[PDB]
């Protein structure tokens, strides 16, 4: 079930001064790069131009390196509209993208947040406010709306274009996606808390328990996925002993790669 | 949906106060003015998207804008100038990409 | 300059046809609109170009817009004494209040009568 997302980033510092960064993301790998200072999308993955022609890849990038310069002068031209209302700095960003499904189903979402909130987003044919947001946005959004223009695009990119490259994208990256990667674990404490770090594997999917032979300990806390640089995730196991406990405790560790080969580290 | 402007011609004198002014009953909350000049297209001064708000267009430098009411756009030379010759046009729109435009106004500045 | 006119004028008899062109740089390009204007008079708008490639006339004034060859023309058929006037070409780039307008010089037309 493998979600894709073009995430963008755009600040605006005063009436002058501004930028907009993006990234693109199949499921937890990065595809694309797109940094303000560059005038054409990276590729980060060979396979990044999924199935799309060349013609077709550069005729895609046209349509958003426009897009980008229009949607800067835009912002600016809203700000000056509802002013004294909202004023710099101001910080958009845009989430868009669908997700992919059994079958030949998707689902698209366009969601705008501004400040941080989640505001705005693109639903059937039309912008349109969510719960939560300040009735002052009605105005961008009627002026948003009148562009028939753009409507008719973004709908295109939503319903057809995205659904599209992506299962394209998933026939050229099969390998990558379904990367097998083995974790490797150490042991450590602290001040007594004992620590079971799991570092290397991928796909994110994984199991760490803290045990006394069999027993499972119903104490371990399982912390955050953190990343390693090199796609890869990073995972601790926490166990709260007192001290002196600490013989016969093992950490048992599941995952994919391993092939039923579950890793046993004792203290 | 109409637009006027007052006067539609003046002469005047370098250093005076002269004030262009657009009267729009359509209720649009955006106006625009604009000078043509032979050898040019119309060139943006300054515009407006609301009672109380001007902007600075293209060539915003010897203008000051006002806009007091939903219904007005006043163009000020605080000290025409020669080269503040021309015909100026006014012009208004909703939220849609028309504008419509005024008769326009020829103003000479002599020395 | 992001929007030229051609020619820069032309004279021609009543009755016959004639053609101006409008080549612009202007982007991204929304729509383009012809006006015209009596010497005096303000500006008559007598079309609206809108679709990648669009076609569209108005009595004996025709028009045409090819968005990839970012290009215009204005066909006035059977030309009358009354079309003596400028021709001013207007591309604006966004489908809304939002946009700016980017207008070109004219052409200068002038009919024998």
């Known amino acids: 079930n493998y979600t894709f997302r073009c995430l963008q980033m755009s600040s605006f510092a005063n009436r002058s001064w501004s930028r907009t960064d993006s990234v693109v993301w199949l499921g937890d790998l990065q595809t694309h790069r797109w940094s303000n200072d560059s005038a054409t999308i990276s590729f980060t993955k060979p396979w990044s131009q999924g199935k799309l022609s060349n013609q077709q890849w550069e005729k895609l990038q046209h349509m958003f390196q426009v897009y980008r310069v229009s949607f800067t002068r835009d912002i600016q031209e809203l700000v000056k509209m509802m002013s004294p209302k909202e004023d710099y700095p101001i910080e958009i960003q845009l989430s868009a993208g669908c997700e992919m499904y059994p079958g030949n189903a998707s689902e698209s979402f366009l969601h705008v947040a501004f400040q941080g909130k989640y505001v705005v987003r693109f639903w059937g044919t039309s912008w349109q406010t969510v719960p939560g947001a300040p009735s002052w946005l009605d105005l961008p959004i009627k002026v948003l709306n009148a562009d028939q223009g753009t409507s008719a695009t973004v709908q295109m990119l939503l319903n057809d274009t995205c659904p599209l490259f992506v299962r394209g994208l998933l026939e050229a990256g099969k390998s990558d996606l379904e990367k097998q990667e083995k974790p490797v674990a150490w042991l450590s404490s602290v001040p007594r808390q004992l620590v079971c770090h799991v570092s290397g594997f991928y796909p994110k999917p994984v199991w760490v328990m803290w045990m006394r032979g069999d027993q499972e300990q119903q104490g371990t806390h399982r912390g955050d996925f953190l990343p390693n640089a090199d796609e890869t995730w990073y995972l601790q196991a926490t166990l709260d002993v007192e001290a002196g406990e600490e013989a016969g405790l093992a950490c048992r560790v599941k995952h994919s790669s391993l092939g039923g080969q579950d890793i046993i580290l004792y203290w | 949906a109409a637009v006027t402007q007052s006067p539609r011609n003046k002469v005047a004198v370098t250093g005076g106060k002269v004030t262009l002014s657009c009267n729009q009953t359509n209720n649009h909350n955006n106006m625009y003015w604009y000078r043509q000049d032979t050898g040019h297209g119309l060139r943006l001064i300054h515009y407006s998207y609301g009672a109380g708000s001007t902007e600075k267009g293209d060539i915003p430098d010897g203008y000051k804008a006002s806009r007091p009411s939903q219904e007005n756009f006043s163009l000020i030379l605080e000290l025409a100038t020669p080269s503040q010759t021309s015909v100026y046009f006014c012009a208004s729109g909703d939220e849609g990409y028309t504008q419509y435009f005024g008769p326009g106004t020829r103003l000479l500045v002599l020395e | 300059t992001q929007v030229e006119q051609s020619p820069q004028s032309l004279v021609v008899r009543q009755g016959e046809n004639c053609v101006l062109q409008?080549?612009?740089?202007?982007?991204?390009?929304?729509?383009l609109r012809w006006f015209k204007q009596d010497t005096g008079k303000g500006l008559v708008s007598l079309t609206v170009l809108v679709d990648q490639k669009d076609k569209t006339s108005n009595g004996r004034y025709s028009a045409t817009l090819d968005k990839d060859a970012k290009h215009s023309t204005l066909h006035i058929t059977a030309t009358l004494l009354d079309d003596t006037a400028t021709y001013i070409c207007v591309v604006g780039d966004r489908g809304s209040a939002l946009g700016r307008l980017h207008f070109g010089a004219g052409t200068q037309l002038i009919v024998i009568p």
């Open positions: 409008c080549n612009y740089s202007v982007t991204p390009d929304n729509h």
